[PDB]
Amino acid sequence: RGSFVEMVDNLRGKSGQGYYVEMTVGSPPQTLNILVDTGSSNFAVGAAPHPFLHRYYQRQLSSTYRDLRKGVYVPYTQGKWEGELGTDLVSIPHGPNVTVRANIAAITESDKFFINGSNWEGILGLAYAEIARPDDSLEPFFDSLVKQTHVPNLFSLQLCGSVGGSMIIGGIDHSLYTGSLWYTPIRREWYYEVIIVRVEINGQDLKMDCKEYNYDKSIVDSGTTNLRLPKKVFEAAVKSIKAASSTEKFPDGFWLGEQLVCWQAGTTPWNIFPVISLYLMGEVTNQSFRITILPQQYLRPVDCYKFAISQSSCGTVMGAVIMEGFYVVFDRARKRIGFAVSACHVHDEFRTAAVEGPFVTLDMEDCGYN
Ligand SMILES: COc1cccc(OC)c1CN1CCC(NC(=O)CCCS)CC1
């Protein structure tokens, strides 16, 4: 409790391609690299020789595999993945020293799911059963882990922007953050849903209705790269970012993500870009705290940079942009999410990412969409 040296630096990845952990499935253990995703609830792995894959789940080689005789089809905006459901012995080599029987979706057909040149072969859905496919009766991995072992109902993520990080399963590592942890309530157990109560652009309020910041929902999602903002909020935020950075010239398609902006090595103007503070609902009535991100977080290197704030039709998504500045504690036991300044985040001598509180905010319940 507090250390967990085995789990430090157990995450790897490429910028914009997500963070993956090493896992084993079946017996004898079949090693796979698995994308860590707090925005979904299915443990799904490649099970067929797709050309993009380094390796895949071979059920015939596993003596402990049990077929569920059920299929799962998961469509989305770009493509899909389809798989066959079963259960097997699942373990995390650089995690807790345990082995559990968990549900595995063996992917047999996919479109625009696997990435050409990537080093991961599956996805670990760490969200709740409510958004699991085909339905809520299929138990997610972490629910199975807690139920079958003495591992506490908690995990934390330190994502550092080759890219790396740490997933601490069953606890918190105090070396991975500086200062204090600040907790925001999980509004509902489906996605990791939170409530944003105020937004500042360089210490300046957007003066919008706080219900707009959570239009539909607001979520913490390690599977999304960008900081996704509601259309009305995005429009207001970019306008304030445009005005704050008027010293340098940028094309119109850049803010929409249709074009990149490039600068000479070491000549990237950070100071011209504003900081972004998100005020989150606190644990106490009328009490809030704020998390502040640097341009280092929302300007993602592709020195060519992409604008990593995008308009969304599904609510606020606090992706890797937000998460890379902070140590994030998914305290499932107490239905809350902790934020603290990451010990590994990208910062300069001028400005640093911050978690500050407490603040006074009234009518925070009105910010949640119904
Ligand atoms: C199965 O989905 C895919 C498909 C291709 C790549 C991929 O890995 C980045 C995933 C995994 N992951 C699922 C959950 C998704 N998150 C959301 O639905 C919230 C945003 C809407 S407001 C993010 C993507």
Tab-separated table of C-alpha atoms and ligand atoms in Angstrom:
chain	number	residue	atom	x	y	z
A	1	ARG	CA	0.000	0.000	0.000
A	2	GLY	CA	1.780	3.114	-1.304
A	3	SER	CA	4.732	1.650	-3.238
A	4	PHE	CA	4.165	-1.114	-5.858
A	5	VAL	CA	7.642	-1.067	-7.486
A	6	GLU	CA	6.725	-3.961	-9.812
A	7	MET	CA	4.013	-1.936	-11.584
A	8	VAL	CA	6.027	1.266	-12.169
A	9	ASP	CA	6.786	1.891	-15.873
A	10	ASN	CA	4.579	-1.045	-16.968
A	11	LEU	CA	2.985	1.009	-19.771
A	12	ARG	CA	4.350	1.690	-23.246
A	13	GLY	CA	2.989	3.405	-26.352
A	14	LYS	CA	3.314	5.716	-29.326
A	15	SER	CA	2.009	9.299	-29.341
A	16	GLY	CA	-1.614	9.262	-30.537
A	17	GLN	CA	-1.737	5.454	-30.578
A	18	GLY	CA	-2.670	4.846	-26.919
A	19	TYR	CA	-1.018	3.183	-23.921
A	20	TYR	CA	-0.652	-0.597	-23.628
A	21	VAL	CA	0.142	-3.059	-20.829
A	22	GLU	CA	1.585	-6.571	-21.105
A	23	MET	CA	-0.935	-9.303	-20.316
A	24	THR	CA	-1.087	-13.091	-20.586
A	25	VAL	CA	-4.099	-15.187	-21.596
A	26	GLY	CA	-4.627	-18.942	-21.197
A	27	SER	CA	-2.287	-21.737	-20.111
A	28	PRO	CA	0.502	-21.985	-20.992
A	29	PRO	CA	0.444	-18.136	-20.802
A	30	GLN	CA	0.182	-16.377	-24.175
A	31	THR	CA	1.770	-12.924	-23.943
A	32	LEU	CA	-0.067	-9.992	-25.563
A	33	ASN	CA	0.241	-6.196	-25.485
A	34	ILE	CA	-3.128	-4.757	-24.524
A	35	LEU	CA	-4.373	-1.169	-24.883
A	36	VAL	CA	-5.518	0.351	-21.575
A	37	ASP	CA	-8.936	1.964	-22.116
A	38	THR	CA	-11.097	3.569	-19.405
A	39	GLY	CA	-13.678	4.513	-22.070
A	40	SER	CA	-14.907	0.960	-22.728
A	41	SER	CA	-15.687	-2.253	-20.799
A	42	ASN	CA	-14.723	-5.186	-23.045
A	43	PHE	CA	-11.558	-7.242	-22.828
A	44	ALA	CA	-11.083	-7.978	-26.533
A	45	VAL	CA	-7.999	-9.475	-28.207
A	46	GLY	CA	-6.982	-10.388	-31.771
A	47	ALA	CA	-7.596	-14.110	-32.297
A	48	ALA	CA	-6.846	-14.428	-36.017
A	49	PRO	CA	-3.738	-13.710	-38.169
A	50	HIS	CA	-4.564	-10.118	-39.163
A	51	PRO	CA	-1.638	-8.624	-41.190
A	52	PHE	CA	-1.163	-5.688	-38.777
A	53	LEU	CA	-0.734	-7.974	-35.743
A	54	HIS	CA	2.555	-9.027	-34.125
A	55	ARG	CA	0.750	-11.907	-32.410
A	56	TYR	CA	-2.753	-13.128	-31.530
A	57	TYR	CA	-4.775	-15.242	-29.105
A	58	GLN	CA	-4.614	-18.925	-30.042
A	59	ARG	CA	-7.470	-20.625	-28.165
A	60	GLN	CA	-6.500	-24.121	-29.367
A	61	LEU	CA	-3.185	-23.837	-27.474
A	62	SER	CA	-4.904	-23.047	-24.159
A	63	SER	CA	-6.022	-25.931	-21.924
A	64	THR	CA	-8.105	-23.624	-19.694
A	65	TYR	CA	-10.220	-21.955	-22.419
A	66	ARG	CA	-14.015	-22.280	-22.103
A	67	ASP	CA	-16.316	-21.293	-24.979
A	68	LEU	CA	-19.426	-19.261	-24.101
A	69	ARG	CA	-21.117	-20.101	-27.438
A	70	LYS	CA	-21.997	-16.419	-27.955
A	71	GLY	CA	-20.960	-13.809	-30.519
A	72	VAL	CA	-20.351	-10.082	-30.081
A	73	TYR	CA	-20.519	-7.342	-32.731
A	74	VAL	CA	-19.153	-3.904	-31.825
A	75	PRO	CA	-19.674	-1.166	-34.461
A	76	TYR	CA	-18.500	2.462	-34.259
A	77	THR	CA	-18.027	5.636	-36.349
A	78	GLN	CA	-15.096	4.449	-38.504
A	79	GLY	CA	-15.420	0.645	-38.541
A	80	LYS	CA	-16.040	-2.335	-36.251
A	81	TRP	CA	-14.757	-5.418	-34.481
A	82	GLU	CA	-16.546	-8.759	-34.203
A	83	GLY	CA	-15.569	-11.654	-31.948
A	84	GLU	CA	-16.423	-14.920	-30.225
A	85	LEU	CA	-17.001	-14.884	-26.463
A	86	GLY	CA	-15.256	-17.187	-23.986
A	87	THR	CA	-13.407	-17.291	-20.658
A	88	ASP	CA	-9.791	-18.098	-19.757
A	89	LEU	CA	-7.030	-17.484	-17.196
A	90	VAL	CA	-5.856	-13.863	-17.409
A	91	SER	CA	-2.775	-12.387	-15.715
A	92	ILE	CA	-0.715	-9.170	-15.712
A	93	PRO	CA	3.052	-9.977	-15.449
A	94	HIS	CA	4.020	-6.457	-14.293
A	95	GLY	CA	0.908	-6.179	-12.110
A	96	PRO	CA	-0.559	-8.029	-9.107
A	97	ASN	CA	0.716	-11.588	-8.605
A	98	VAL	CA	-2.691	-13.173	-9.313
A	99	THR	CA	-4.527	-15.103	-12.045
A	100	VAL	CA	-8.272	-14.768	-12.712
A	101	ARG	CA	-10.900	-16.276	-14.999
A	102	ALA	CA	-12.179	-13.372	-17.096
A	103	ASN	CA	-14.341	-12.907	-20.191
A	104	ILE	CA	-12.395	-12.610	-23.446
A	105	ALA	CA	-13.793	-11.489	-26.788
A	106	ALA	CA	-11.702	-13.305	-29.385
A	107	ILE	CA	-11.694	-10.928	-32.373
A	108	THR	CA	-12.215	-12.857	-35.619
A	109	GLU	CA	-13.146	-9.929	-37.893
A	110	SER	CA	-12.353	-6.204	-37.668
A	111	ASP	CA	-12.385	-2.985	-39.696
A	112	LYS	CA	-10.273	0.077	-38.764
A	113	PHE	CA	-9.566	-1.356	-35.300
A	114	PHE	CA	-5.943	-2.510	-35.433
A	115	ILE	CA	-3.307	0.043	-36.436
A	116	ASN	CA	-0.649	-0.689	-39.077
A	117	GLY	CA	2.740	-0.457	-37.349
A	118	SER	CA	1.365	-0.541	-33.789
A	119	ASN	CA	2.628	-2.853	-31.036
A	120	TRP	CA	-0.695	-3.802	-29.390
A	121	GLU	CA	-2.981	-6.761	-30.155
A	122	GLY	CA	-6.019	-6.048	-27.972
A	123	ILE	CA	-7.956	-3.751	-25.661
A	124	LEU	CA	-8.654	-3.764	-21.923
A	125	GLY	CA	-11.996	-2.178	-21.113
A	126	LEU	CA	-11.703	-0.790	-17.583
A	127	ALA	CA	-15.111	0.941	-17.426
A	128	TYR	CA	-18.317	-0.542	-15.959
A	129	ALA	CA	-20.641	-3.369	-17.084
A	130	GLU	CA	-23.375	-0.876	-18.075
A	131	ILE	CA	-21.620	-0.009	-21.368
A	132	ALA	CA	-20.248	-3.534	-21.937
A	133	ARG	CA	-21.194	-5.422	-25.111
A	134	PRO	CA	-23.403	-7.262	-25.964
A	135	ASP	CA	-25.022	-6.308	-22.635
A	136	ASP	CA	-24.420	-5.632	-18.920
A	137	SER	CA	-24.363	-9.345	-17.979
A	138	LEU	CA	-20.858	-9.786	-19.423
A	139	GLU	CA	-18.532	-9.085	-16.491
A	140	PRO	CA	-15.615	-6.699	-17.267
A	141	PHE	CA	-12.047	-7.717	-16.361
A	142	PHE	CA	-11.602	-5.483	-13.307
A	143	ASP	CA	-14.927	-6.585	-11.799
A	144	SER	CA	-13.762	-10.211	-12.199
A	145	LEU	CA	-10.359	-9.331	-10.711
A	146	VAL	CA	-11.822	-7.746	-7.556
A	147	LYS	CA	-14.431	-10.497	-7.049
A	148	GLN	CA	-11.949	-13.390	-7.381
A	149	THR	CA	-8.942	-11.932	-5.494
A	150	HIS	CA	-7.987	-9.707	-2.539
A	151	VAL	CA	-6.911	-6.925	-4.936
A	152	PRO	CA	-8.645	-3.694	-3.760
A	153	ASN	CA	-11.292	-2.082	-5.995
A	154	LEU	CA	-8.975	0.689	-7.229
A	155	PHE	CA	-6.517	1.476	-10.018
A	156	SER	CA	-4.442	4.504	-11.009
A	157	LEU	CA	-2.879	5.737	-14.245
A	158	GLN	CA	0.207	7.841	-14.856
A	159	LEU	CA	0.511	8.515	-18.582
A	160	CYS	CA	3.723	10.248	-19.678
A	161	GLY	CA	3.752	12.084	-23.022
A	162	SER	CA	8.536	6.315	-27.570
A	163	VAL	CA	5.957	7.040	-24.861
A	164	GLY	CA	5.524	5.366	-21.436
A	165	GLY	CA	3.722	5.351	-18.080
A	166	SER	CA	2.390	3.364	-15.113
A	167	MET	CA	-0.805	1.488	-14.254
A	168	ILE	CA	-0.968	0.696	-10.535
A	169	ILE	CA	-3.521	-2.073	-9.986
A	170	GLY	CA	-5.069	-2.266	-6.510
A	171	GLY	CA	-3.565	0.922	-5.105
A	172	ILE	CA	-1.660	4.185	-5.402
A	173	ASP	CA	2.057	4.972	-5.733
A	174	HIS	CA	3.013	8.223	-3.983
A	175	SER	CA	6.259	8.572	-5.975
A	176	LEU	CA	4.176	9.075	-9.134
A	177	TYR	CA	2.701	12.421	-8.028
A	178	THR	CA	3.635	15.677	-6.298
A	179	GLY	CA	1.448	17.686	-3.917
A	180	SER	CA	-2.056	16.595	-2.959
A	181	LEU	CA	-4.754	14.411	-4.510
A	182	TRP	CA	-8.129	16.031	-5.210
A	183	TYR	CA	-11.220	13.885	-5.716
A	184	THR	CA	-14.226	14.349	-8.002
A	185	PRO	CA	-17.309	12.093	-7.726
A	186	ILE	CA	-18.108	9.484	-10.372
A	187	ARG	CA	-21.622	10.636	-11.319
A	188	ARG	CA	-22.770	7.252	-12.642
A	189	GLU	CA	-21.039	3.881	-12.981
A	190	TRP	CA	-21.022	3.297	-16.753
A	191	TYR	CA	-18.308	5.459	-18.268
A	192	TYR	CA	-16.048	7.152	-15.726
A	193	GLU	CA	-18.422	10.114	-15.722
A	194	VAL	CA	-17.488	13.378	-14.009
A	195	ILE	CA	-18.904	16.922	-13.886
A	196	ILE	CA	-17.116	20.070	-15.055
A	197	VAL	CA	-18.443	23.135	-13.227
A	198	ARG	CA	-16.247	25.902	-14.692
A	199	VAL	CA	-13.769	26.368	-17.552
A	200	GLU	CA	-11.004	28.977	-17.702
A	201	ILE	CA	-8.776	29.927	-20.638
A	202	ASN	CA	-5.613	31.519	-19.185
A	203	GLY	CA	-7.386	32.473	-15.940
A	204	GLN	CA	-10.389	33.822	-17.857
A	205	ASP	CA	-13.887	32.360	-17.463
A	206	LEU	CA	-15.880	31.379	-20.567
A	207	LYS	CA	-19.045	32.524	-18.730
A	208	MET	CA	-21.034	29.687	-20.349
A	209	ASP	CA	-23.830	27.754	-18.649
A	210	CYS	CA	-22.119	24.909	-16.764
A	211	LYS	CA	-24.641	22.370	-18.112
A	212	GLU	CA	-23.039	22.919	-21.538
A	213	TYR	CA	-19.612	21.701	-20.329
A	214	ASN	CA	-21.238	18.328	-19.675
A	215	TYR	CA	-23.750	18.324	-22.550
A	216	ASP	CA	-24.696	14.657	-22.702
A	217	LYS	CA	-21.707	13.692	-20.497
A	218	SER	CA	-18.133	14.328	-19.326
A	219	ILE	CA	-15.743	11.373	-19.072
A	220	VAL	CA	-12.161	10.406	-18.227
A	221	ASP	CA	-10.898	8.255	-21.100
A	222	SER	CA	-7.395	6.815	-21.571
A	223	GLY	CA	-8.414	5.359	-24.959
A	224	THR	CA	-9.055	8.771	-26.524
A	225	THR	CA	-6.026	10.857	-27.530
A	226	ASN	CA	-7.659	14.297	-27.716
A	227	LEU	CA	-9.414	16.533	-25.227
A	228	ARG	CA	-12.890	16.392	-26.753
A	229	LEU	CA	-15.210	19.316	-26.035
A	230	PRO	CA	-18.950	19.793	-26.727
A	231	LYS	CA	-19.597	21.722	-29.957
A	232	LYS	CA	-20.850	24.879	-28.183
A	233	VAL	CA	-17.984	24.711	-25.649
A	234	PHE	CA	-15.347	23.931	-28.314
A	235	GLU	CA	-16.463	26.947	-30.373
A	236	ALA	CA	-16.121	29.218	-27.317
A	237	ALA	CA	-12.814	27.676	-26.172
A	238	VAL	CA	-11.044	27.912	-29.555
A	239	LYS	CA	-12.197	31.540	-29.939
A	240	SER	CA	-10.506	32.332	-26.606
A	241	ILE	CA	-7.384	30.351	-27.592
A	242	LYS	CA	-7.256	32.130	-30.986
A	243	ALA	CA	-7.385	35.547	-29.285
A	244	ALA	CA	-4.782	34.605	-26.652
A	245	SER	CA	-2.345	33.519	-29.382
A	246	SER	CA	-2.542	36.446	-31.832
A	247	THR	CA	1.236	37.059	-32.024
A	248	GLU	CA	1.698	34.053	-34.351
A	249	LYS	CA	-0.276	33.237	-37.513
A	250	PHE	CA	-2.106	29.927	-38.003
A	251	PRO	CA	-4.279	28.541	-40.854
A	252	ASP	CA	-8.051	28.168	-40.307
A	253	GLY	CA	-8.026	24.389	-40.918
A	254	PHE	CA	-5.589	23.816	-38.034
A	255	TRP	CA	-8.127	24.508	-35.253
A	256	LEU	CA	-10.551	22.072	-36.925
A	257	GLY	CA	-7.822	19.412	-37.172
A	258	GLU	CA	-7.720	19.394	-40.985
A	259	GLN	CA	-4.097	20.611	-41.079
A	260	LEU	CA	-0.889	20.551	-39.017
A	261	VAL	CA	1.331	23.439	-37.889
A	262	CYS	CA	5.118	23.078	-37.993
A	263	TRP	CA	7.994	25.039	-36.448
A	264	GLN	CA	11.794	24.743	-36.519
A	265	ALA	CA	13.422	22.562	-33.837
A	266	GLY	CA	13.217	24.368	-30.482
A	267	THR	CA	11.374	27.401	-31.883
A	268	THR	CA	7.893	26.272	-30.789
A	269	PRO	CA	6.221	29.219	-29.026
A	270	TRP	CA	4.722	27.814	-25.811
A	271	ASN	CA	4.266	31.147	-23.982
A	272	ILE	CA	1.897	32.488	-26.665
A	273	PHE	CA	-0.581	29.654	-26.001
A	274	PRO	CA	-2.952	29.889	-22.994
A	275	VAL	CA	-3.326	27.391	-20.143
A	276	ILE	CA	-6.637	25.532	-19.778
A	277	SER	CA	-8.216	25.057	-16.350
A	278	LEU	CA	-11.074	22.638	-15.771
A	279	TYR	CA	-12.989	23.084	-12.532
A	280	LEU	CA	-14.379	19.768	-11.331
A	281	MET	CA	-17.104	19.099	-8.756
A	282	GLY	CA	-15.582	18.377	-5.335
A	283	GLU	CA	-16.444	15.915	-2.575
A	284	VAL	CA	-18.163	18.588	-0.476
A	285	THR	CA	-21.286	20.667	-1.187
A	286	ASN	CA	-20.399	23.955	-2.957
A	287	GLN	CA	-16.732	22.878	-3.046
A	288	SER	CA	-14.703	22.494	-6.237
A	289	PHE	CA	-11.105	22.125	-7.413
A	290	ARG	CA	-9.324	22.901	-10.688
A	291	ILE	CA	-6.880	21.045	-12.917
A	292	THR	CA	-4.661	23.084	-15.272
A	293	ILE	CA	-3.029	21.832	-18.505
A	294	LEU	CA	-0.189	23.337	-20.564
A	295	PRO	CA	0.128	23.781	-24.361
A	296	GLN	CA	2.551	20.828	-24.077
A	297	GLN	CA	-0.537	18.672	-23.447
A	298	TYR	CA	-2.918	19.907	-26.167
A	299	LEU	CA	-0.242	20.415	-28.847
A	300	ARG	CA	0.650	16.835	-29.804
A	301	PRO	CA	3.854	16.162	-31.830
A	302	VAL	CA	3.292	14.278	-35.104
A	303	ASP	CA	8.525	20.047	-35.134
A	304	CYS	CA	4.983	19.488	-36.443
A	305	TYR	CA	2.110	19.640	-33.947
A	306	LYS	CA	-1.582	18.762	-34.167
A	307	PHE	CA	-4.288	20.668	-32.288
A	308	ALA	CA	-5.442	18.020	-29.807
A	309	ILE	CA	-8.688	19.740	-28.813
A	310	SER	CA	-11.631	18.640	-30.950
A	311	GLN	CA	-15.394	19.124	-31.223
A	312	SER	CA	-17.450	16.167	-30.007
A	313	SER	CA	-21.032	14.989	-30.497
A	314	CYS	CA	-20.923	12.723	-27.427
A	315	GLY	CA	-19.792	15.100	-24.648
A	316	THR	CA	-16.538	16.102	-22.948
A	317	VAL	CA	-13.794	13.493	-23.214
A	318	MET	CA	-10.783	14.040	-20.970
A	319	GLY	CA	-8.377	12.005	-23.086
A	320	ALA	CA	-4.605	11.535	-23.016
A	321	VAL	CA	-4.280	15.328	-23.391
A	322	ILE	CA	-5.681	15.853	-19.881
A	323	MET	CA	-4.389	12.585	-18.391
A	324	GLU	CA	-0.731	13.150	-19.377
A	325	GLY	CA	-0.463	16.118	-17.001
A	326	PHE	CA	-1.859	14.247	-14.003
A	327	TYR	CA	-1.737	11.145	-11.841
A	328	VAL	CA	-5.288	9.816	-12.061
A	329	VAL	CA	-6.809	7.561	-9.402
A	330	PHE	CA	-9.892	5.560	-10.372
A	331	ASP	CA	-11.201	5.016	-6.842
A	332	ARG	CA	-14.023	2.600	-7.711
A	333	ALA	CA	-14.439	1.703	-4.020
A	334	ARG	CA	-15.502	5.265	-3.101
A	335	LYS	CA	-17.074	6.151	-6.484
A	336	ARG	CA	-14.605	8.986	-7.134
A	337	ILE	CA	-11.667	9.998	-9.343
A	338	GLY	CA	-8.489	11.535	-7.906
A	339	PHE	CA	-6.290	14.114	-9.605
A	340	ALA	CA	-2.737	15.093	-8.655
A	341	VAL	CA	0.153	16.741	-10.509
A	342	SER	CA	2.122	14.043	-12.339
A	343	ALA	CA	5.816	13.627	-11.539
A	344	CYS	CA	6.457	12.815	-15.225
A	345	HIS	CA	4.473	15.467	-17.144
A	346	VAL	CA	6.057	17.643	-19.855
A	347	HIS	CA	6.691	21.158	-18.510
A	348	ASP	CA	9.007	24.168	-18.856
A	349	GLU	CA	10.655	26.529	-16.334
A	350	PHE	CA	7.895	29.123	-16.873
A	351	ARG	CA	4.637	27.183	-16.430
A	352	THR	CA	3.640	23.902	-14.748
A	353	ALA	CA	0.490	21.737	-14.692
A	354	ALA	CA	-1.490	22.201	-11.473
A	355	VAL	CA	-4.214	20.756	-9.250
A	356	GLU	CA	-5.556	23.459	-6.909
A	357	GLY	CA	-8.345	23.776	-4.331
A	358	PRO	CA	-10.664	24.336	-2.651
A	359	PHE	CA	-12.895	26.784	-4.539
A	360	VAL	CA	-16.466	27.969	-3.951
A	361	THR	CA	-18.932	26.952	-6.669
A	362	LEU	CA	-22.716	27.024	-6.232
A	363	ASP	CA	-25.366	25.056	-8.177
A	364	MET	CA	-22.916	22.332	-9.267
A	365	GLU	CA	-25.772	19.792	-9.498
A	366	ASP	CA	-27.248	21.874	-12.348
A	367	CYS	CA	-24.145	21.192	-14.474
A	368	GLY	CA	-25.086	17.515	-14.899
A	369	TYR	CA	-27.201	16.751	-17.967
A	370	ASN	CA	-30.371	14.665	-17.609
B	1	LIG	C1	-13.873	-0.328	-30.013
B	1	LIG	O1	-13.471	1.034	-30.151
B	1	LIG	C2	-12.236	1.367	-30.650
B	1	LIG	C3	-12.049	1.352	-32.033
B	1	LIG	C4	-10.818	1.683	-32.587
B	1	LIG	C5	-9.766	2.037	-31.749
B	1	LIG	C6	-9.942	2.062	-30.364
B	1	LIG	O2	-8.884	2.415	-29.561
B	1	LIG	C7	-8.351	3.741	-29.579
B	1	LIG	C8	-11.182	1.737	-29.809
B	1	LIG	C9	-11.350	1.759	-28.295
B	1	LIG	N1	-12.068	2.891	-27.699
B	1	LIG	C10	-13.451	2.491	-27.429
B	1	LIG	C11	-14.047	3.563	-26.518
B	1	LIG	C12	-13.989	4.927	-27.198
B	1	LIG	N2	-14.510	5.949	-26.309
B	1	LIG	C13	-15.743	6.441	-26.432
B	1	LIG	O3	-16.661	5.849	-26.985
B	1	LIG	C14	-15.971	7.809	-25.831
B	1	LIG	C15	-15.960	8.870	-26.928
B	1	LIG	C16	-17.376	9.193	-27.389
B	1	LIG	S1	-18.000	10.621	-26.466
B	1	LIG	C17	-12.546	5.232	-27.596
B	1	LIG	C18	-11.994	4.124	-28.493
